[PDB]
Design a binder for these strands. Structure first.
Ligand code: CL
Ligand code: NA
Length: 131
RNA sequence: GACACCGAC
DNA sequence: GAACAGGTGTC
């Protein structure tokens, strides 16, 4: 474990359903950011937004710490700069799809060296940002 | 299919 | 705390 890191995760009520996410200091569990709930989204959209918010957070603070995510899906989406969600686009899902499109747009207009690391839940237990 | 992840004593 | 039925994604 790279203890000098940011861990991020989604939490939801329903999937699809109400989605939020947070970022914590891996060593302490201190909460560094938390997103206001978004009324309908998916687990994987939330995981993606959490990583990209973490990138933005660390870049603004000139931090070189890595990010841990437990999401193989979201780590791939970030590497690709494309969130390949199945969630239908409708008036109910407009909000989350706007956030996702904006996060992709951030990735296409900024650089980062931040390592995005898979949290190994099977070895290490739940990620520290788990709800 | 395998894997990573997220309502109801 | 501990003991069936879902969706969202990749490989
Ligand atoms: Cl960054
Ligand atoms: Na985890």
């Amino acid at each position: 474990i790279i203890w000098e890191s940011l861990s991020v995760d989604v939490g939801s009520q329903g999937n699809p359903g109400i989605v939020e996410y947070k970022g914590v200091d891996t060593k302490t569990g201190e909460v560094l950011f938390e997103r206001e709930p978004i009324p309908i989204g998916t687990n994987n959209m939330g995981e993606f937004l959490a990583i990209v918010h973490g990138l933005r957070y660390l870049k603004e603070r000139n931090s070189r710490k890595p990010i841990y995510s437990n999401s193989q899906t979201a780590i791939k989406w970030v590497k690709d700069k494309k969130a390949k969600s199945t969630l239908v686009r409708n008036e109910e899902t407009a909000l989350i799809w706007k956030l996702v499109d904006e996060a992709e747009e951030w990735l296409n207009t900024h650089t980062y060296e931040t390592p995005i690391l898979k949290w190994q839940t099977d070895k290490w237990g739940e990620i520290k940002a788990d709800y």
